[PDB]
């Protein structure tokens, strides 16, 4: 989809200081700090004007902050419930595995403006296991499409089929 791949490319082309000012902006909105809003305008407004399929404001802001925090490379076929879910096969099935499973289970019951913290702990579990690649494009178009039930359905049984291999 156009408008999202170039968003991921521009996020990946961001330099270290820009990622730092995005990192400090994590945990709050963008109305209290200027350079966060200037950066969101610079990375959104021309790409919003150029394409009709630009992502929604808050999901784009969430993915920008999470990419600044974690910095995983973009790679096709590396979405969240595959990588976590293959991670969920190497744990103790009676105690630890239900706890990490509930950590991933929490994600299905948030709106878009508190969603970054359970995602942050999930991506921290990913970082603790040396995971370098994530389908950032896949994550953001399934996150912008969060209003429907079938998308969460295919999310979930993708986790299931990653678990049963």
């Amino acid at each position: 989809n156009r408008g999202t791949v170039d968003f991921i490319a521009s996020l990946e082309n961001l330099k270290e200081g820009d990622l730092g000012i995005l990192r400090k902006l994590r945990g709050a909105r963008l109305d209290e700090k200027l350079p966060g809003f200037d950066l969101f305008s610079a990375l959104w407004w021309p790409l919003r004007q150029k394409n009709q399929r630009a992502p929604k404001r808050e999901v784009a802001w969430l993915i920008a902050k999470l990419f600044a925090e974690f910095r995983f490379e973009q790679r096709e076929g590396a979405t969240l419930p595959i990588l976590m879910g293959g991670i969920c096969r190497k744990l103790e099935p009676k105690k630890e595995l239900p706890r990490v499973l509930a950590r991933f289970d929490q994600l299905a019951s948030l709106d878009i403006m508190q969603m970054e913290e359970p995602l942050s702990v999930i991506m921290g579990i990913l970082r603790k296991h040396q995971q370098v690649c994530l389908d950032w494009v896949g994550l953001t178009d399934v996150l912008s499409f969060w209003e429907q039930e079938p998308v969460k359905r295919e999310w979930s049984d993708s986790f299931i089929k990653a678990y049963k291999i």
Binding site: D111, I112, W146, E147, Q148, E149
Partner: protein, 255 residues
């Protein structure tokens, strides 16, 4: 000529109708499981009520020993997939003993659903069994509107005080008896920017936007909370914000 009343009513978590095993009554529609309130449940809830009790009225509306009553109701098919839930209760012994717990220690069943409720009246036969009392028939139709607007199934309500009111009533005077249950062959999926009742009323509006393309309609929402059709299109003849003026407009249309 037929007066058709399609009511959308969102009920808070309760158990209005119970089957043999205590579950909420359940039907099957749109290729998914729906919550159901039986027709006779709504009939007896509307009947025997001081909200409605205030030749013989209410014998013609609901029959009693070849009356063929003018008013009949459809089973309340939910607009979405039914979500039945287990509630676990205990009843304390409230006398200090060496143990704890004394009651049934059982489980009850409950569900919350947005019901589409269909009502149909024939005017001519309602006049016919009223021996030509047109004014009495108009008054009893207004009484039906007043009651069914504010009467709920008096099921298990002491522990589940569900006294919600309908958020949308569509009254038409069309030719053939049609139910808009086919509007909700789609179960209502909830989005972040809209609620369940708004989406159900929108599905109804998008379905009455058809049929006419291939009659009139009075739309009632409390103080225009939910407008039938989020446009300026000729879909609802009169957007009405209050129930009393809705009943007045319907009565002055009839007579």
């Amino acid at each position: 000529m037929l007066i058709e009343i399609h009511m959308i009513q969102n009920h808070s978590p309760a158990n209005l109708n119970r089957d043999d095993l205590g579950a909420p009554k359940t039907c099957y529609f749109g290729g998914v499981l729906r919550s159901r309130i039986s027709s006779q449940c709504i009939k007896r809830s509307i009947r025997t009520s001081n909200d409605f009790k205030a030749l013989a009225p209410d014998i013609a509306l609901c029959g009693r020993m070849t009356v063929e009553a003018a008013l009949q109701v459809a089973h309340a098919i939910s607009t979405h997939i039914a979500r039945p839930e287990i509630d676990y209760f205990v009843a304390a012994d409230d006398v200090p003993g060496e143990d704890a717990g004394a009651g049934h220690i059982g489980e009850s069943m409950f569900a919350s659903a947005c019901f589409y409720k269909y009502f149909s009246i024939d005017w001519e036969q309602l006049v016919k069994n009223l021996k030509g009392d047109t004014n009495l028939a108009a008054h009893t139709v207004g009484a039906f509107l007043l009651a069914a607007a504010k009467t709920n199934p008096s099921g298990k309500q002491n522990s589940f005080a569900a006294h919600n009111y309908p958020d949308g009533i569509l009254v038409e005077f069309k030719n053939s008896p049609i139910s808009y249950a086919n509007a909700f062959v789609r179960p209502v999926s909830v989005v972040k920017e809209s609620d369940l009742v708004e989406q159900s009323i929108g599905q109804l509006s998008n379905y009455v936007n058809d049929i006419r393309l291939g009659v009139i309609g009075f739309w009632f929402s409390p103080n225009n909370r939910y407008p039938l059709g989020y446009k300026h299109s000729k879909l609802a003849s009169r957007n009405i914000g209050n129930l009393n003026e809705l009943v007045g407009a319907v009565l002055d249309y009839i007579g």
